Amino acid sequence: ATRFRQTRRRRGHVSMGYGRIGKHRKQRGGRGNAGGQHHRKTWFTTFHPDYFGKHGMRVFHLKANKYYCPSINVDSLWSLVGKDVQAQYKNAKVGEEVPVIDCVKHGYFKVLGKGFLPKQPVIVRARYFSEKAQQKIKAVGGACELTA
Amino acid sequence: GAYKYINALNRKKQSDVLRFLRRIRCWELRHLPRIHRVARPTNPERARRLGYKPKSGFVIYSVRIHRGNRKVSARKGIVHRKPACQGIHKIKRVKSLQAIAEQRVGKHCGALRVLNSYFIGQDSTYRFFEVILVDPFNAAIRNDPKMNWICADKQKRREARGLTSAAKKSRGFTGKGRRYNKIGAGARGNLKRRNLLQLKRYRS
Amino acid sequence: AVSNIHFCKDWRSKVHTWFKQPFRKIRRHQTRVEKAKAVFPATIKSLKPSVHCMNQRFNYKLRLGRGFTLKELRAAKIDKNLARTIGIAVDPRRKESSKECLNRNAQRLTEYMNRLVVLPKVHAATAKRLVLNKKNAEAKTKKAAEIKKFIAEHNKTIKELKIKVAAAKKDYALKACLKGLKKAQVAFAAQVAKKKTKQFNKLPVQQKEAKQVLDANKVIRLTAPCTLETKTLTKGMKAFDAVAHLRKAKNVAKAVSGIVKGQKK
Amino acid sequence: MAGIAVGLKRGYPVHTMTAKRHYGVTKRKHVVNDVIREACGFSAYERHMMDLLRRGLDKKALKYAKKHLGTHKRGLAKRDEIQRALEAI
Amino acid sequence: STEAGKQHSAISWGTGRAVARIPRISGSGSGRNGQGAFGNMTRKGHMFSPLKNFRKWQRKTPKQMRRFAVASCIAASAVPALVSARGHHIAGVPQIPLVVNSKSISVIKKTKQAVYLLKKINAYSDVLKVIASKTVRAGQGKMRGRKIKERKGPLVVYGNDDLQAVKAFRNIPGVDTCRVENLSVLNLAPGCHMGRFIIWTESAFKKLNTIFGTQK
RNA sequence: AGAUUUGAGUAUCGUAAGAGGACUCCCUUAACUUAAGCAUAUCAAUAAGGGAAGGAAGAAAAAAUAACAAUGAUUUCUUAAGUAAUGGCGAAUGAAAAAGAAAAAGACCAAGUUGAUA
RNA sequence: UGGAAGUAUAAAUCGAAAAGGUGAUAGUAUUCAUCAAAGUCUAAAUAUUACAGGAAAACUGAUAGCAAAGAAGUACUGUGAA
RNA sequence: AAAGAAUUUAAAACAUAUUAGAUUUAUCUGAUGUGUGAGACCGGUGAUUUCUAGUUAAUCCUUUAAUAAUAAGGCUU
């Protein structure tokens, strides 16, 4: 909306809001990230203190698909099936049917242990598990299943 | 078959028998005109492999080219350039001498179509090739379904556009895969596609 | 934020505008329509396999492939030369990936073959295939009796047991029936092992009203719909340690280096 | 229930299914190889090898091949073929 | 044009000639020589930053917020105070959510019958106001073909089974028809004023619950 | 004298040239500019110069990916992605497999075999 | 070249094979995987600001819009490119 | 020493054994068996993981199909 710009409120003022002493010239210290170590050093130091240098090892052709591993905590497991299914099997135990919360079908490969689980048995099937995730699942009375 | 021994023989170019024949052939070509017609290929095995057929409309032309590397065509070796472009020697042509020689035969013989070319010999100064050419307006070539593809209009001056095997190799079409990322379907066309800034009709 | 804009080259001649986008839709649609008019199952988008995706990130999803392998055509009893002419894609380049891939794509071709109807190569009713199918009709009816009757004897035990388990789950919503069916299934499989079939089945060729369908990959669904899975929680699963099994697998592979160094010293 | 994603025995339990075809020559290639050898002889760089192998300097012969062929494996094969023809004469 | 005003070989004459430093046309023999050049303050030069055809013409809106506004635009059509305030003569209409029989619509095939239906339900007060107050445009827009400027009348919203009665209503001045599924703010709130006088058919009205659902 | 090989002149029937080059395939070692100087770098397959074609051209049927519950010619679009990487590691430059679609199609030479051989 | 102990091309020298290439950190070895180079053609989906014929426009309205709304690349200038 | 059924019918690589047709060469080319490579246990076997005490080995991370000795790259000073 060019009628709402500041140019329409500065029609009449000579300098168009840029000053009389310090004019509005072409450059204000270079073109781009110029002077990263000379006259803009106090800027890079202040706001990007690790901009210059090297760190870590080079990966010549990284495989970003190999680091793909979506994760879900234990407190978010029962949402994968719903609160209505959870209440249906609330009073189950060992011996009768218990819902299987598979996570690969929903797109989660690893299960982590954070938060709390409802005090019901459950069968959690996933590719990877955490040490504290399996404790919380087994303490509630459930099982851990691997995949792939 | 006769040609399974000629092919095996021709790979022994360092042998005395083949070095003698190459020595005599290069002497004769050093005195005949630069581009001239020979009756039959001196390497009938290699000519047949590249596409030569002993039928009407197939002709063979010998071209002699001065190998080595030339200087940058700057007067008195003076170029007004930054030191990153001031070299005069050691700059190699991108097109192989085979593709360079094919164009000269094609320009000289503008009414024919260049099929392919193969290597004959070389000396301290020259390198000699033989070029397979086809007459596209011969009735035999037109009426043969397996070879009448040469009669298409886009085959006019095949080697100049870069369609012959010698010329296509200089374009980068020697293989496939991640080694040839920049020469997918043409280096310049591939470069333009990667540099396109697509501005969709509805964009954020 | 340190800006990273690659506009220092000539971007103005690099700009591609999509003003032709609303007109590409009309153009492609009109050609799709015209293709079906010309020869209708040419746009049928010839049937394609159900291949998995690559990498562990995608391997649990099925997707349409390109052409069935020559082993999948033999398993489904289809001539590879006739396959390309009845809207089946063929890919001799693909090597078979697994037995399960071979089985899954074998039923994909079998299901397609039953649905397929091939019109005669000559419309006139005196075409050979129409004449032959009338000539050998009495032999087919005689053959059909043997196939029907000796199918009806081999599946007597399996069919009866399969009814029991179906009703057992109905009343329960069981253990005894499942053991019975499992024990029967082993014996049937072991009986088949202890054997020469048709090389090629017949092409279904008949005269019918032309109901034209624009594709076959949307008719034969890749995967069956998914539902909630529930299992019987037993003492065995309650004590299985998944973390210990993962660290054992990780450490065993990392221990193959020390094994090789130990021998060479 | 569904293997494991780590280790040597990693992967979904399935039945993987390809023939390791061998690209080679026939029995007649012996004749063509020998006939061409008589009609041609040995290159300049092969003959120098044949002298070194005669003197028993096998390591120096391999170093000479590696220079003129550019591969350790191709140099080994050339050093084998040259010494095989040495025992023929 | 991307080469408009920049089609000269002009360079500045420098200083020392008692003329400004703006670039000047080269050569002699015409009055054009020695004149101004590319600069936007000069005559026959390029303007300020020339307009480029790759601007952002079309805009993007989230789909849910597009549907939020349509429901608010449909809901406002049932308020006679807002429908009248938009400029619609709805004094004589029986009910403000005017719904007509689907059997009556199915027999409409001519514009004489479509007009008859509009008169019966007292909707012709709006149709006649557009007819009586049609005028001509005021400005340069007439050179571009936009001459006649008409007002807005009733909107006829039909269903899938009322596809043959569209041809009857389309020639009536200031009567725009639409389908119940293809509704948008461009019909329901023309000029960004809400409360269009909508005439529903039986099928479209009975489909509104399927299309939009309820608050539960 | 005869049988061939090679190279010419002439006659007949044809073929190339010139225009255009917006888009297509290539050759060539520009510089202004940026880096607050500047010398590698950037501008930049960019400008100019040169050649060749069509209604499209180029590419096209794996000496290809991948390390998987695996794929499968070429082309184009979405995403990966301003990412891996490159760089006075400065300014800056900068992909591809996977995955989602448009369209889909495979065929021949040479080598080998058959020779009362055609 | 993004390709980093060399991604591609070319030149000088060298130059294979009872085959072999690739798995981007150079090297040797043993396995594994996947292909089988050094000849040719191939529609469809894609591009287009030459030029021609049409249709549209929140475009300009005679110092604007093409340089050109009239016998406009015309009148006029230069030896000439222009 | 204490806790553990382990998932379910369409198969090619050929290490091989045995024959058939040819070859002399750094010799091969077809087909028939077998195991490999197989996986459906009947409260109890137990494949499998854990714990303790020894003993042998390997141990800072990476070179992305797996290892090895050189080499190179990481991290801290």
UniProtKB/Swiss-Prot annotation, chain A:
The keyword Ribosomal protein applies. It is found in: Cytoplasm, Cytosol; Cytoplasm; Endoplasmic reticulum. GO terms for cellular component: cytosolic large ribosomal subunit; endoplasmic reticulum. The keyword Ribonucleoprotein applies. Keywords: Cytoplasm, Endoplasmic reticulum, Ribonucleoprotein, Ribosomal protein. Its main location: cytoplasm. It comes from the Eukaryota. Residues 20-39 are annotated as: Disordered. GO terms for biological process: translation. It holds the Pfam family Ribosomal_L27A. Belongs to the universal ribosomal protein uL15 family. Component of the large ribosomal subunit. HAMAP family: Ribosomal_uL15. PANTHER family: 60S RIBOSOMAL PROTEIN L27A (PTHR11721), LARGE RIBOSOMAL SUBUNIT PROTEIN UL15 (PTHR11721:SF3). This is Large ribosomal subunit protein uL15A.
